[PDB]
């Protein structure tokens, strides 16, 4: 009766990309 | 001040000058535009046709500063929409960035790591394209040191982040051989002491275990489960969240994979997780529990032994609705697979009243789920001849009122389950 993650949910909300605004 | 707030027009003029220093100065000006707090003019830079120039500058071994400035500029273009990332890839940036991974200049190598992570972060196609161009070997070589602690913090964090994007996304999942290639380095990162590295390493593991049993097994066989359980108890929410995500993913696998989670001691952490002040943690934890109660009777027994049934009663009684739903699933699964004795224990812990109260929900499927659980519990009472005591317990807390009403519910399945319960026990 195991239920995997629903296809309509994201993978946890972490940013996919990052812009570098400082050094 | 010299390279601050140039117009795109002026940037183009400098870049088209064929004076390398003028080009460097203009590339830095572009970098600063693309690095500003608000609304970087990414499309304007793309429209000005600058990407091919920036890409060419990546190859200027003789002028490391323009390599860095252009890598930074390109990183930021690639950080935008899929169309903006595509523009960078279309300009030939992938192999050029991979070549820079070997740079003697750490800040340049790091910038290339970052850019490649943005590209891979776009989706499985670009992820897989970065892999085909051969990024994994040089990326892993940068981490091939005796002790990770010798690396600059920022550098290591960027490397971990880019590696996690290479583990990310499905349809399709990353190539099996790429995953196998990355895992040992990932396992090592999972034991590092920097909170940011730990968080991203856990995220990577969560992506890898979000898939069929074969994908889960690749990770579990590396022996990381005990470390994941340790991270599950971390103080930092940014670590607990991905650790729990991965543990939950693992227990969607076979009963043997689930046992590894139990054996590693994960259940002792659930009293805290199931009362965690972060709504999402309670929800994820209860979902995880529902997949554990879908296991074997000996695994349900361990849930019992760890005292987790009262915590499930708690969540059913009071939690965010999404969490209460996972709780309902946990109970239905439990009652479906449990022994008579285990099911009876459920009732003694007080499951019945909060189950009945949830029948007032406007969610059709959880009514089905709850009605299923009640059927299961009744079935267990039958074998004891105690059906009457349950019927009364259910009527006393207002449960019979709710069920009878559910005969004029417009869903077919709840219609049947309702009348059938009445017919049989009321």
Which of B122, B287, B336 is closest, CB to CB, to A1? B336
Buried b (16+ CB within 10 A) or exposed e, B30-59: bbbbbbeeeebbbeebbebebbebbbbbbe
Q: Dihedral, CA atoms, B414, B420, B423, B425, nearest 10 degrees?
A: -100
Q: Is the peptide bond before B373 cis (omega within 30 degrees of 0)?
A: no
Which of B30, B33, B35, B113 has the highest number of chain A CBs within 10 A, making it the mutation to test binding with A? B35
Looking at residue B406, the DSSP 8-state letter turns out to be T
Rounded to whole angstroms, the Cα distance separating B386 from B352 reads: 15
Rounded to whole angstroms, the Cα distance separating B319 from A2 reads: 22
Picking from B321, B264, B320, the residue whose alpha carbon sits closest to that of residue B292 is B264
Experimental technique, in short, is X-ray
Rounded to whole angstroms, the Cα distance separating B284 from B322 reads: 10
How far is B180 from chain A, CA to nearest CA, in Å? 21
The two tokens of residue B250 are: 């693992």
Is B192 strand, coil or helix? coil
Contact B307, B295 (CB under 8 A): no
Contact B199, B239 (CB under 8 A): yes
Cα-Cα-Cα-Cα dihedral sign, residues A7, A11, A12, A18: negative
- List chain A residues with CB under 8 Å of B40: 19
Rounded to whole angstroms, the Cα distance separating A22 from B409 reads: 59
3-state SS, B229-257, equals HHHHCCCCHHHHHHHHHHHHHHCCCCHHH
Looking at residue B4, the DSSP 8-state letter turns out to be S
- Degrees, nearest 5: CA angle B260-B338-B224: 10
Rounded to whole angstroms, the Cα distance separating B177 from B180 reads: 5
- List chain B residues with CB under 8 Å of A21: 35-37
- DSSP alpha helices (H): ranges in B133-175? 136-142, 153-167
Picking from B258, B193, B196, the residue whose alpha carbon sits closest to that of residue B225 is B258
Which of A11, A14, A20 is closest, CB to CB, to B75? A20
Chain A contact present for B32, CB below 8 A: no
Chain A contact present for B423, CB below 8 A: no
Rounded to whole angstroms, the Cα distance separating B180 from B40 reads: 38
Between chain A and chain B, how many beta carbons pairs sit less than 8 Å apart?
65
Contact A19 B203 (CB under 8 A): no
Residue in the block written with tokens 């990577």: B204
Contact B164, B183 (CB under 8 A): no
Rounded to whole angstroms, the Cα distance separating B57 from B17 reads: 14
Say how far residue B60 (Cα) sits from the centre of its chain.
39
Task: Report in angstroms the alpha-carbon separations of A20 from B157, B194, B303, B362.
Answer: 14, 21, 46, 46
The topology under which CATH files domain B1-426 is: 1.25.10
Task: Report in angstroms the alpha-carbon separations of B258 from B286, B329, B385.
Answer: 15, 17, 34
Residue in the block written with tokens 């915590």: B311
Rounded to whole angstroms, the Cα distance separating B152 from B158 reads: 10
Looking at residue B47, the DSSP 8-state letter turns out to be H
Q: At CB < 8 Å, which residues of chain A contact B? A: 1-5, 11-12, 14, 16-22
Picking from B73, B34, B31, the residue whose alpha carbon sits closest to that of residue B52 is B73
Contact B35 A11 (CB under 8 A): no
Total length of chain A: 23
Task: Report in angstroms the alpha-carbon separations of B398 from B345, B353, B405.
Answer: 21, 8, 11
Radius of gyration of chain B (CA): 28
The two tokens of residue B252 are: 């969607």
Contact B77, B42 (CB under 8 A): yes
Contact B252 A21 (CB under 8 A): no
Contact A12 B241 (CB under 8 A): yes
The two tokens of residue B51 are: 């990407």
Task: Report in angstroms the alpha-carbon separations of B105 from B7, B46, B100, B116.
Answer: 30, 27, 9, 17
């Amino acid at each position: 009766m195991s239920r995997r993650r629903h296809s309509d949910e994201n993978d946890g909300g972490q940013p996919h990309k990052r812009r570098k605004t400082s050094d | 001040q010299g390279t601050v707030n140039w117009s795109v027009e002026d940037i183009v003029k400098g870049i088209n000058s064929n004076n390398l220093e003028s080009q460097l100065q203009a590339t830095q000006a572009a970098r600063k535009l693309l690095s500003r707090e608000k609304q970087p003019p990414i499309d304007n830079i793309i429209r000005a046709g600058l990407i091919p120039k920036f890409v060419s500058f990546l190859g200027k071994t003789d002028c490391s500063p323009i390599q860095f400035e252009s890598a930074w500029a390109l990183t930021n273009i690639a950080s935008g929409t899929s169309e903006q990332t595509k523009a960078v890839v279309d300009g030939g940036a992938i192999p050029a960035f991979i070549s820079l991974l070997a740079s003697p200049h750490a800040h340049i190598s790091e910038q290339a790591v970052w850019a490649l992570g943005n590209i891979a972060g776009d989706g499985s196609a670009f992820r897989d394209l970065v892999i085909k161009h051969g990024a994994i070997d040089p990326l892993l070589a940068l981490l091939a040191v005796p002790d990770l602690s010798t690396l600059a913090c920022g550098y290591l964090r960027n490397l971990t982040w880019t590696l996690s994007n290479l583990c990310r996304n499905k349809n399709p999942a990353p190539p099996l051989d790429a995953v196998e290639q990355i895992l040992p380095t990932l396992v090592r990162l999972l034991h590092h002491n920097d909170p940011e590295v730990l968080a991203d390493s856990c995220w990577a593991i969560s992506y890898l275990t979000d898939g069929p049993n074969e994908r889960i097994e690749m990770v579990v066989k590396k022996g990381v489960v005990p470390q994941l359980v340790k991270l599950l108890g971390a103080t930092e929410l940014p670590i607990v969240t991905p650790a729990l995500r991965a543990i939950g993913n693992i227990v969607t696998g076979t009963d043997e994979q689930t046992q590894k989670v139990i054996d590693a001691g994960a259940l002792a952490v659930f009293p805290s997780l199931l009362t965690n002040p972060k709504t999402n943690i309670q929800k994820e934890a209860t979902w995880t529990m529902s997949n554990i109660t879908a296991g074997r009777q000996d695994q349900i027994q361990q849930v019992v032994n760890h005292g987790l049934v009262p915590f499930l009663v708690g969540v059913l009684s009071k939690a965010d609705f999404k969490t209460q739903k996972e709780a309902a699933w946990a109970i239905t699964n439990y009652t479906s697979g449990g022994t008579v004795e285990q099911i009876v224990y459920l009732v003694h812990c007080g499951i019945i009243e909060p189950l009945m109260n949830l029948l007032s929900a406007k969610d059709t499927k959880i009514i089905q789920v709850i009605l299923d659980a009640i059927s299961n519990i009744f079935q267990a009472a039958e074998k004891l001849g105690e059906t009457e005591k349950l019927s009364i317990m259910i009527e006393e807390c207002g449960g019979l009122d709710k069920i009878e009403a559910l005969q004029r519910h417009e869903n077919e399945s709840v219609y049947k389950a309702s009348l059938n319960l009445i017919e049989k026990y009321f």
